[PDB]
Design a protein around this nucleic acid. Structure first.
Ligand code: MG
Ligand code: MG
Ligand code: ZN
Lengths: 52, 190, 205, 196, 153
RNA sequence: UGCCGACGCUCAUCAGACCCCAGAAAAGGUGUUGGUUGAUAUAGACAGCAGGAUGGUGGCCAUGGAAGUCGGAAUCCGCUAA
């Protein structure tokens, strides 16, 4: 159905992200602070949930 | 506090001829000419060294925000040297599950038509930036190759064609379809 | 069920204790004041940490119980159930009043008792946790979590005393070894040079 | 604690450099202590092995340059991942048995194969599996009677060939480990003598 | 065609749920036919899990026994085994002397993965109290006896 | 004040601007600036790119079973660069 080395490219660009708990912003995986001004650049981050 | 002097340094190879008009850097070599204007940074650029082997960037009496812009210029000029000597090549794959992404090339690489993305009847026509040539490559199944001298224009065109194939109102973690940047490199090797 | 704590926050009225004049006060929300391993000797919990108020305000008994429950439940998870002693050094003695509007308005508007708060000054210790020297950051984190149950601003201060005593920790062991201090369960007894000599003989024998 | 072990390493260098002045330097390249302990059992009465910081190694022996002038050339010859093994007895038998005692190590993704590796005719021992990962490189194999049975020898990786993870799961399932990474000898020390 | 298999066993008592089937699968031996022998040839353990290895030839099996490090300690300390219910308070409350640990030292000397005699008593006397046992006392009594009063041959 | 005023701080896609006084709190920020305290650093540190995390042990504990990972008293050895 799909090739795995092509799959990890799309997981890198689509779901391997960090989500801000305060403003739902999609951040890079090595993020400790959200880049949005409206949440006050908070450090309250979580990983993006992996699909099952 | 303001640091008295902050300087950084670009080592220019002998294949490259560089000249400056104030804060406007012109770079000429084997593949062409690149011009970048730096009148918004307010630094001192010096083309010292006989035969101009070395370029020096100075910030005098700068704060922490102003000292960050020095190696930014030293990276931009190195990117221009790299893109005039070796060039820039953005190899990028197209990932799909069911519908094959049909990619055709028009007007000698300046326009790219995308058909059958997620089974849609809409044709995505992507204009390319002036100076960037796009082509369907060989030896791989579904891969496009972008060619140029300017990393800004090449990567911005790659961002345009990547954001052209985006999935709307679906779970994008499941619908992992599009055209994604796989490898960033040069035209010829070093 | 009750009013928010911003109503009865500042020390406005004179202190109004439970007495033979003010009767009918409901029971205070906090009744357990010290807990953990409170049956512990002096020489095994040498580190003491205080939460110290920086404001002159009233702290409710509900807030006191909510803070000590949180401090207990963090310190049990952090250092075990028998490796600490938490003592709340504030007892709710001020009685706040409620004037119910069922329509007489402000005629005869003296309040019936509603609840109990504690009048707290600047620099006054709210809670004190004693434990070993290795559990310093756990005491700091437990008091930092308990700061969120209180109005106003509090500070965290690691004391220079030895546990729940009034003697300095650098000289405490020497003063015990010179038999000027005697262990007396949770705290110590200070022995001066002013008694009859028959107690000095019983001390040094 | 590091403050005391940092002083314990110097005594270990100082009181053993005067013991064995015949030091065949070996290279610890992706090796584990489970492989080191197998070496240490045969190497008790003859040679002793040691690992440590190479800068601290450069510091310890340069305090011996005054009272032991035979140790001058060791500082240009300790670069990269370097550990000690110390020997007094002979120079040839420690060539013989160190290259003898080898245990196999599993394949990696980015580790070279230094010689020609063959795949002999042997049954896999498992029935119907992924048959699309056999003709991808070019291995001829007919699925005979359900169980996958391979036919002939296919040179998967020759010398001067970069490797990847495309040939790792088929080795892991069949327990075929091509190369055993061992302590290769880089430098020879016999009282000042240097050999290749 | 020799092909050994690594299999963990339960003892001389027969269990209920079988997990030994897939490793004896590809050569084709009957599970209870080999499971009666894997218990009866072993025989002595009868109470605790033990790695009894299975070295099968092209025709029939061989029942070899490779003891563990502290399973021999549990075997030497003779607690009477109860039924298979695994009831409460089956702890090891018994006394071990200094002669019931040198046999493991000589065994692991003969198999050669250890330090010298102080080391090969030092693993097993250190791990004797790991389970919750005592060699007439806790681990602080094996650091005093090894220093200048050891049982080194 | 049209003084060639002094030294700093601050960028707001909601800047701020003078007793009463005419509008804000707890909590936060890897924005930036100044401090307090504690570490380790040429016996070579923080990044950044590999090996290895096991032997006892699948610890005893409580369970339908929890095996370095779902609870809780515990929290010791070897080899050791680990
Ligand atoms: Mg939907
Ligand atoms: Mg009043
Ligand atoms: Zn955010």
């Amino acid at each position: 159905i799909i090739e795995p080395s092509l799959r990890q490219l799309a997981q890198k660009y689509n779901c391997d992200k960090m989500i801000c708990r305060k403003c739902y912003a999609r951040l890079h995986p090595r993020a400790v602070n959200c880049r949005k001004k409206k949440c006050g650049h908070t450090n309250n981050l979580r990983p993006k949930k992996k699909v099952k | 506090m303001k640091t008295i002097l902050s300087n950084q340094t670009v080592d220019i190879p002998e294949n490259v001829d560089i000249s400056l008009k104030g804060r406007t850097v012109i770079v000429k070599g084997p593949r062409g000419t690149l011009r970048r204007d730096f009148n918004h940074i307010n630094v001192e650029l010096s083309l010292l060294g006989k035969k101009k082997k070395r370029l020096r960037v100075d910030k005098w009496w700068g704060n922490r925000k102003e000292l960050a812009t020095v190696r930014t210029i030293c990276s931009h000029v190195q990117n221009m040297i790299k893109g005039v000597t070796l060039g820039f090549r953005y190899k990028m794959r197209s990932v799909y599950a069911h519908f094959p992404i049909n990619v055709v090339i028009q007007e000698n690489g300046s326009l790219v038509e995308i058909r059958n993305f997620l089974g849609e009847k809409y044709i995505r026509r992507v204009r390319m930036r002036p100076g960037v040539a796009c082509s369907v490559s060989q030896a791989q199944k579904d891969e496009l190759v972008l060619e140029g001298n300017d990393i800004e224009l090449v990567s911005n065109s790659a961002a345009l064609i990547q954001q052209a194939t985006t999935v709307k109102n679906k779970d994008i973690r499941k619908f992992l379809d599009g055209i994604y940047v796989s490898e960033k490199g040069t035209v010829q090797q070093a | 069920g009750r009013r928010p704590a911003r109503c009865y926050r500042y020390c406005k009225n004179k202190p109004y204790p439970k007495s033979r004049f003010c009767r009918g006060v409901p029971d205070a929300k906090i009744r357990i004041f010290d807990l953990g391993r409170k049956k512990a000797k002096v020489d095994e919990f040498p580190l003491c940490g205080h939460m110290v108020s920086d404001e002159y305000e009233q702290l409710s008994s509900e807030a006191l119980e909510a803070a000590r429950i949180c401090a207990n439940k963090y310190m049990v998870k952090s250092c075990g159930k028998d490796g600490f002693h938490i003592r709340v050094r504030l007892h709710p003695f001020h009685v706040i009043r409620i004037n119910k509007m069922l329509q007489t308005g402000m005629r005869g508007a003296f309040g019936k008792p509603q609840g109990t708060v504690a009048r707290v000054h600047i620099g006054q210790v709210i809670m004190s946790i004693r434990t070993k020297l290795q559990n310093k950051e756990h005491v700091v984190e437990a008091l930092r979590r308990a700061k969120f149950k209180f109005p106003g601003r509090q500070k965290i201060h690691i004391s220079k005393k030895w546990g729940f005593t009034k003697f300095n920790a650098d000289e405490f062991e020497d003063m015990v070894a010179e038999k000027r201090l005697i262990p007396d369960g949770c705290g110590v007894k200070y022995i001066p040079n002013r008694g009859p000599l028959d107690k000095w003989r019983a001390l040094h024998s | 604690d590091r403050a005391t072990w940092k002083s314990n390493y110097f005594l270990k260098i100082i009181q053993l450099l005067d013991d064995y002045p015949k030091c065949f330097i070996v290279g610890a390249d992706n090796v584990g202590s489970k492989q080191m302990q197998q070496i240490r059992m045969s190497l008790r009465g003859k040679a002793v092995v040691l690992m440590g910081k190479n800068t601290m190694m450069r510091k310890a022996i340069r305090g011996h340059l005054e009272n032991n002038p035979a140790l001058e050339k060791l500082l240009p010859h300790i670069r990269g991942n370097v550990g000690f093994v110390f020997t007094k007895e002979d120079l040839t038998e420690i060539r013989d048995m160190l290259l003898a005692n080898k245990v196999p190590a599993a394949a990696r993704a980015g580790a070279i194969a230094p010689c020609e590796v063959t795949v002999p005719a042997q049954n896999t021992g498992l029935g119907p599996e992924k048959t699309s990962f056999f003709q991808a490189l070019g291995i001829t194999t007919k699925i005979s009677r359900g169980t996958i049975e391979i036919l002939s020898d296919v040179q998967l990786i020759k010398t001067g060939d970069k490797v990847g993870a495309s040939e790792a799961t088929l080795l892991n399932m069949l327990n075929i480990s091509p190369f055993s990474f061992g302590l290769i000898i880089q430098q020879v020390f016999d009282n000042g003598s240097i050999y290749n | 065609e020799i092909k050994v298999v690594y299999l963990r066993c339960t003892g001389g008592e027969v269990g209920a749920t079988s997990a030994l089937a897939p490793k004896i699968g590809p050569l084709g031996l009957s599970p209870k036919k080999v499971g009666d022998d894997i218990a009866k040839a072993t025989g002595d353990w009868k109470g605790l899990r033990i790695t009894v290895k299975l070295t099968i030839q092209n025709r029939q099996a061989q029942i070899e026994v490779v003891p563990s490090a502290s399973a021999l300690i549990i075997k030497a300390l003779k607690e009477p085994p109860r039924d298979r219910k695994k009831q409460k308070n089956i702890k090891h409350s018994g006394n071990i002397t200094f002669d019931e640990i040198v046999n493991i030292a000589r065994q692991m000397r003969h198999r050669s993965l250890a330090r010298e005699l102080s080391g090969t008593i030092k693993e097993i006397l250190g791990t004797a109290q790991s389970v919750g046992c005592n060699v007439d006392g806790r681990h602080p009594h094996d650091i005093i006896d090894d220093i200048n009063s050891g049982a080194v041959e």
